[PDB]
Amino acid sequence: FIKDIKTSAYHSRYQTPFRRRREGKTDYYARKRLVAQHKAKYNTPKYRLVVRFTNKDIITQIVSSTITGDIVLAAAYSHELPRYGITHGLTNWSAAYATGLLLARRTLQKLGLDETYPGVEEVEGEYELTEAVEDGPRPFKVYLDVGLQRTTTGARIFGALKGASDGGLYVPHSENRFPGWDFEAEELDADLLRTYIFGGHVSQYMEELADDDEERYRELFKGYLADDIDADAVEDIYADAHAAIREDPAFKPTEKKFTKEQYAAESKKYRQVKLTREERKARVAAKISALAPQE
Template identity: 35%
Template sequence: MKEGPRYKLALKRRRQGKTDYHLRYKLVISQKPRAVVRKTNKYILVQIVEFDAKGDKVIAAAHSKELSKLYNWKGYSKNICTAYLTAYLAGLRARQKGIKEVVLDIGLQTPVKGSRVFASLKGLLDAGIKVPHSDDILPDEERIKCGSISKWAQDLKENDPEFYKRQFSKQLERLPPEELSKHFEEVLNSIKSSFSNISLEGDRQ
């Protein structure tokens, strides 16, 4: 009796290029929760996820659009500053649930030094979550705190006001970009004060 070709159909998400199951397996066997960082066209999402055979369980999460709703964030919704704040919020929520250590899961994103996914990593670290990492992949403090944007905006405002208005047209509707660095600190302090039951002293990695 003749038989047809023998092959195994790949899982749907692998066929669609959405999941690297080899990488996922290595993360899962660590037996630690995963910090899943994902980007959309407009937002940043950070979830603390635990593996379950019936489906992953989200223990804590934060979405960048929450920053404007809960903390009056007037900056961009998906840049490095926002990625840091979103992860910081997710990290504090995870600590409230008893999570102390995670592994970073960036999915199919290309790991680029100083990128938004590693700004998110820095946010988790500063929230007191332990994450295996190398310090040289993290963005510098000035970029994380919107300092580079504020300085550039101030320079453009003084030397090329027309380009300044074009470049920051949408941001100017919410807040002058040269004030973003100060505003970042205000929002960060607001997030900290909303988690006053968590000690943040000595938690920075």
């Protein structure tokens, strides 16, 4: 006895769950729903807003889905945000709202919907879906992929939503999972939403740690005391960024440094190679001969 359950039998019979599923990557149960468009619409694509918070980054893509393999329309990474001002905190709520807001403005420039559909310029943190203009083109419609991330009332994913929404996209959404929503009353405290858009929730935690515990205030926020950026200037940083995005978000790529071919040649040093059928037989033959005289 022990149990014994990985016989040839088991493996032979066992079904591999897709791969994305196997790399705990995505919910195909929800992909089914999210991607499949009305067949009576035919080839029209269903754009879906991928939002992914990695450990220490945000990735936001607007994606179409094909048989071929889902194609990207536009991509806004948070690590592209220091060109607009934001050095510090690129996984915030605010950072999301930046990446989100920027997405809209990436896409809308590459769809010719710049002037019409400016999005929410003023930003009171008021709940407003981008209403269509009469006798004109409609707004680009994207459905949010949270994905295998959780949606919990007031998570960053909805930042990047509200950005994109308020950046000019129509993204069908509701209020509640924005912060400052009363759990015990169907309402929004629009003041509490402004704060999260402008890192106000961060500038409060700045302010508390200034008086109380200067141990962690020097540990955390090393970026802020190095640049000499104190609590109450955070609003203006995000504020100026938003406008900076609205101006010129058309995506510059990196300077590269070294060609693709140089890169490959450098990585190809480290990757180990396989072996010919003869080279394995050589190892086996060597292993066999190691045990004929015993040692």
